[PDB]
Protein backbone atom coordinates (compact mmCIF):
# COMPACT_ATOMS: atom_id res chain seq x y z
CA UNK A 1 0.00 0.00 0.00
CA UNK A 2 2.97 2.28 0.63
CA UNK A 3 3.94 4.51 -2.30
CA UNK A 4 0.69 3.69 -4.13
CA UNK A 5 -1.17 6.46 -5.94
CA UNK A 6 -4.66 5.07 -5.30
CA UNK A 7 -3.87 4.66 -1.60
CA UNK A 8 -2.70 8.29 -1.51
CA UNK A 9 -5.95 9.37 -3.15
CA UNK A 10 -8.01 7.46 -0.57
CA UNK A 11 -6.02 9.00 2.29
CA UNK A 12 -6.59 12.46 0.79
CA UNK A 13 -10.32 11.73 0.56
CA UNK A 14 -10.47 10.85 4.26
CA UNK A 15 -8.42 13.91 5.24
CA UNK A 16 -10.64 16.20 3.16
CA UNK A 17 -13.83 14.72 4.64
CA UNK A 18 -12.62 15.47 8.16
CA UNK A 19 -11.94 19.06 7.07
CA UNK A 20 -15.43 19.15 5.54
CA UNK A 21 -16.81 18.47 9.02
CA UNK A 22 -14.45 20.98 10.65
CA UNK A 23 -15.64 23.38 13.35
CA UNK A 24 -15.38 26.22 10.82
CA UNK A 25 -17.88 24.44 8.55
CA UNK A 26 -20.04 23.37 11.51
CA UNK A 27 -20.27 26.94 12.82
CA UNK A 28 -20.98 28.07 9.26
CA UNK A 29 -23.94 25.67 9.14
CA UNK A 30 -25.23 26.71 12.56
CA UNK A 31 -25.02 30.44 11.77
CA UNK A 32 -26.43 29.87 8.28
CA UNK A 33 -29.51 28.18 9.73
CA UNK A 34 -30.36 31.34 11.67
CA UNK A 35 -29.42 33.53 8.70
CA UNK A 36 -31.91 31.69 6.47
CA UNK A 37 -34.56 33.10 8.82
CA UNK A 38 -32.85 36.43 9.59
CA UNK A 39 -33.58 39.09 6.95
CA UNK A 40 -35.98 36.55 5.51
CA UNK A 41 -39.81 35.95 5.23
CA UNK A 42 -39.83 39.18 3.19
CA UNK A 43 -39.41 37.15 0.00
CA UNK A 44 -42.82 35.44 0.05
CA UNK A 45 -44.56 38.81 0.35
CA UNK A 46 -42.24 40.28 -2.30
CA UNK A 47 -43.41 37.83 -4.98
CA UNK A 48 -46.72 39.70 -5.30
CA UNK A 49 -46.87 41.96 -8.36
CA UNK A 50 -49.73 44.21 -7.18
CA UNK A 51 -47.35 46.98 -6.08
CA UNK A 52 -45.58 46.64 -9.42
Amino acid sequence: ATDRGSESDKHFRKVSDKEKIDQLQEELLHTQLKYQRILERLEKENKELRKL
Binding site: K18, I21, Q23, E26
Partner: protein, 153 residues
Protein backbone atom coordinates in the same frame (compact mmCIF):
# COMPACT_ATOMS: atom_id res chain seq x y z
CA UNK B 1 -7.66 35.09 40.02
CA UNK B 2 -11.01 35.33 38.21
CA UNK B 3 -9.71 38.25 36.14
CA UNK B 4 -6.56 36.25 35.38
CA UNK B 5 -8.51 33.17 34.29
CA UNK B 6 -11.26 35.04 32.38
CA UNK B 7 -9.99 38.51 31.42
CA UNK B 8 -13.18 39.25 29.44
CA UNK B 9 -15.89 37.60 31.55
CA UNK B 10 -16.79 35.33 28.64
CA UNK B 11 -18.33 32.78 31.05
CA UNK B 12 -17.95 34.56 34.41
CA UNK B 13 -20.74 34.88 36.99
CA UNK B 14 -20.10 36.95 40.13
CA UNK B 15 -21.81 36.34 43.48
CA UNK B 16 -21.59 38.09 46.83
CA UNK B 17 -22.09 36.08 50.02
CA UNK B 18 -22.88 36.77 53.67
CA UNK B 19 -25.41 39.35 52.51
CA UNK B 20 -27.51 38.99 55.67
CA UNK B 21 -24.34 39.61 57.68
CA UNK B 22 -23.51 42.37 55.19
CA UNK B 23 -26.67 44.26 56.20
CA UNK B 24 -24.95 45.39 59.41
CA UNK B 25 -21.45 44.90 57.93
CA UNK B 26 -21.91 45.98 54.31
CA UNK B 27 -18.75 46.24 52.24
CA UNK B 28 -18.21 49.92 51.55
CA UNK B 29 -19.39 51.17 48.13
CA UNK B 30 -15.96 52.53 47.23
CA UNK B 31 -14.51 49.02 46.90
CA UNK B 32 -17.43 46.63 46.43
CA UNK B 33 -19.36 48.57 43.78
CA UNK B 34 -16.19 48.87 41.69
CA UNK B 35 -16.04 45.06 41.82
CA UNK B 36 -19.72 44.70 40.92
CA UNK B 37 -19.16 47.12 38.03
CA UNK B 38 -15.91 45.44 36.97
CA UNK B 39 -13.81 48.56 37.61
CA UNK B 40 -11.64 47.73 40.63
CA UNK B 41 -10.66 44.47 38.90
CA UNK B 42 -10.51 43.55 35.19
CA UNK B 43 -13.10 40.85 35.96
CA UNK B 44 -16.17 41.18 33.77
CA UNK B 45 -19.19 38.96 34.29
CA UNK B 46 -22.43 37.73 32.79
CA UNK B 47 -24.05 39.33 35.83
CA UNK B 48 -23.25 40.33 39.38
CA UNK B 49 -25.25 38.26 41.84
CA UNK B 50 -25.52 37.77 45.58
CA UNK B 51 -26.76 35.01 47.87
CA UNK B 52 -26.87 34.59 51.64
CA UNK B 53 -24.81 31.86 53.28
CA UNK B 54 -26.19 32.13 56.83
CA UNK B 55 -25.15 34.05 59.93
CA UNK B 56 -22.00 31.98 60.48
CA UNK B 57 -23.81 29.06 62.09
CA UNK B 58 -22.83 25.79 60.44
CA UNK B 59 -26.05 23.82 61.02
CA UNK B 60 -28.39 26.22 59.20
CA UNK B 61 -30.83 24.49 56.85
CA UNK B 62 -31.40 25.28 53.18
CA UNK B 63 -34.88 26.74 53.72
CA UNK B 64 -33.78 29.00 56.58
CA UNK B 65 -30.91 30.45 54.55
CA UNK B 66 -33.18 31.08 51.56
CA UNK B 67 -35.74 32.83 53.78
CA UNK B 68 -33.04 35.04 55.26
CA UNK B 69 -31.90 35.78 51.68
CA UNK B 70 -35.37 36.99 50.74
CA UNK B 71 -35.65 39.26 53.79
CA UNK B 72 -32.21 40.76 53.16
CA UNK B 73 -32.73 41.47 49.47
CA UNK B 74 -36.14 42.99 50.16
CA UNK B 75 -34.76 45.37 52.79
CA UNK B 76 -31.01 45.87 52.38
CA UNK B 77 -28.43 48.05 50.63
CA UNK B 78 -27.34 45.64 47.88
CA UNK B 79 -30.41 46.71 45.86
CA UNK B 80 -31.63 50.00 47.35
CA UNK B 81 -28.41 51.73 46.21
CA UNK B 82 -28.33 49.89 42.86
CA UNK B 83 -25.12 47.88 42.97
CA UNK B 84 -26.57 44.45 42.15
CA UNK B 85 -29.42 43.76 39.77
CA UNK B 86 -32.76 42.67 41.22
CA UNK B 87 -33.08 39.79 38.74
CA UNK B 88 -29.57 38.61 39.74
CA UNK B 89 -30.07 38.14 43.51
CA UNK B 90 -31.41 35.27 45.63
CA UNK B 91 -30.62 31.58 45.21
CA UNK B 92 -33.13 30.79 42.47
CA UNK B 93 -31.97 33.50 40.07
CA UNK B 94 -28.31 32.52 40.40
CA UNK B 95 -29.12 28.83 39.98
CA UNK B 96 -31.23 29.44 36.88
CA UNK B 97 -28.67 31.76 35.29
CA UNK B 98 -25.89 29.23 35.89
CA UNK B 99 -27.94 26.33 34.52
CA UNK B 100 -28.97 28.21 31.38
CA UNK B 101 -25.49 29.52 30.58
CA UNK B 102 -23.97 26.16 31.46
CA UNK B 103 -26.20 24.02 29.30
CA UNK B 104 -26.04 26.37 26.31
CA UNK B 105 -22.25 26.30 26.60
CA UNK B 106 -22.51 22.50 26.86
CA UNK B 107 -24.61 22.14 23.72
CA UNK B 108 -22.18 24.34 21.80
CA UNK B 109 -18.88 22.93 23.09
CA UNK B 110 -19.53 19.25 23.85
CA UNK B 111 -20.60 18.37 20.31
CA UNK B 112 -17.44 19.92 18.86
CA UNK B 113 -15.27 18.28 21.50
CA UNK B 114 -17.09 14.96 21.05
CA UNK B 115 -16.30 14.95 17.35
CA UNK B 116 -12.81 15.87 18.52
CA UNK B 117 -12.89 12.90 20.93
CA UNK B 118 -13.79 10.55 18.11
CA UNK B 119 -10.77 12.16 16.47
CA UNK B 120 -8.87 11.62 19.74
CA UNK B 121 -9.55 7.89 19.81
CA UNK B 122 -8.50 7.56 16.17
CA UNK B 123 -5.44 9.67 17.05
CA UNK B 124 -4.51 7.25 19.82
CA UNK B 125 -5.04 4.43 17.32
CA UNK B 126 -2.65 6.15 14.90
CA UNK B 127 0.33 6.33 17.26
CA UNK B 128 -0.44 3.13 19.17
CA UNK B 129 -0.64 0.82 16.15
CA UNK B 130 2.68 2.17 14.88
CA UNK B 131 4.22 1.63 18.32
CA UNK B 132 2.90 -1.92 18.85
CA UNK B 133 1.47 -3.32 15.60
CA UNK B 134 1.96 -6.94 16.70
CA UNK B 135 0.65 -6.46 20.26
CA UNK B 136 -2.26 -4.32 21.45
CA UNK B 137 -2.94 -2.81 24.89
CA UNK B 138 -0.17 -4.63 26.75
CA UNK B 139 0.26 -4.00 30.48
CA UNK B 140 3.30 -4.06 32.75
CA UNK B 141 1.73 -6.56 35.17
CA UNK B 142 1.01 -8.95 32.29
CA UNK B 143 4.60 -8.44 31.16
CA UNK B 144 5.85 -9.28 34.66
CA UNK B 145 3.85 -12.51 34.77
CA UNK B 146 5.20 -13.49 31.35
CA UNK B 147 8.77 -12.71 32.45
CA UNK B 148 8.30 -14.72 35.64
CA UNK B 149 7.19 -17.74 33.64
CA UNK B 150 10.09 -17.38 31.21
CA UNK B 151 12.67 -16.95 33.98
CA UNK B 152 11.46 -19.96 35.96
CA UNK B 153 11.50 -21.93 32.72
Amino acid sequence: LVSQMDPHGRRTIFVLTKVDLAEKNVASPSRIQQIIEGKLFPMKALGYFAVVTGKGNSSESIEAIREYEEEFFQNSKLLKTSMLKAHQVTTRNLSLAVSDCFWKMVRESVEQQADSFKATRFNLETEWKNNYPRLRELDRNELFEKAKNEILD
